[PDB]
């Protein structure tokens, strides 16, 4: 997510007018923040990928 | 252990070998799509923040 810099000054007429000038300006400093982790389930490994992983484990022996 | 190379370092090697200079071009093509989406969401969140301030 592109970061939001803090609200510079309370007040919509003036402070937010120059806060749009600052945050959305052509020349700006888009710092990044990550989203909160979404609960990804583990991907099921395909069977051919398990005949690749298993063949190396047999080459251990 | 830190001796083990990270995925980004393996992808870096792969990219180097398979496309040293075309990586920048792909970064540019994908950037054009990422920044536009994130700026739309940045402007929507900013509107949401101004709205919540006004409603407060």
Curated annotation (Swiss-Prot), chain B:
Say which domain of life the source belongs to: Eukaryota
**Coiled-coil regions listed in the entry:** none
Q: How is it modified after translation?
A: Phosphorylated on tyrosine; phosphorylation is probably required for its ability to inhibit TP53 transactivation.
Q: In which tissues is it expressed?
A: Weakly expressed in heart, brain and placenta but not in other tissues. Expressed in a number of cell lines, predominantly in those from colorectal carcinomas.
Q: Where in the cell is it found?
A: Cytoplasm; Nucleus; Mitochondrion
Q: How does it assemble?
A: Interacts with isoform p14ARF of CDKN2A which strongly inhibits HUWE1 ubiquitin ligase activity. Interacts with MYCN, POLB and CDC6. Interacts with isoform 2 of PA2G4. Interacts with NR1D1. Interacts with AMBRA1. Interacts with HAPSTR1. Interacts with HAPSTR2. In hepatocytes, interacts with PAQR3; the interaction promotes PPARA poylubiquitination and STUB1-mediated degradation.
Function in brief: E3 ubiquitin-protein ligase which mediates ubiquitination and subsequent proteasomal degradation of target proteins. Regulates apoptosis by catalyzing the polyubiquitination and degradation of MCL1. Mediates monoubiquitination of DNA polymerase beta (POLB) at 'Lys-41', 'Lys-61' and 'Lys-81', thereby playing a role in base-excision repair. Also ubiquitinates the p53/TP53 tumor suppressor and core histones including H1, H2A, H2B, H3 and H4. Ubiquitinates MFN2 to negatively regulate mitochondrial fusion in response to decreased stearoylation of TFRC.
Q: State the disease linkage annotated in the record.
A: Intellectual developmental disorder, X-linked, syndromic, Turner type: An X-linked neurodevelopmental disorder with highly variable clinical manifestations. Common features consist of moderate to profound intellectual disability, delayed or absent speech, short stature with small hands and feet, and non-specific but recurrent dysmorphic facial features such as macrocephaly, microcephaly, a broad nasal tip, deep set eyes, epicanthic folds, short palpebral fissures and a short philtrum. Patients may manifest other features, such as hypotonia, seizures and delayed bone age.
This protein's domain notes: The HECT domain mediates inhibition of the transcriptional activity of p53.
Family, similarity comment: Belongs to the UPL family. TOM1/PTR1 subfamily.
The name on file for this protein is E3 ubiquitin-protein ligase HUWE1
What species is this protein from?
Answer: Homo sapiens
Q: Which residues of the full protein are shown?
A: 2641 to 2696 of 4374
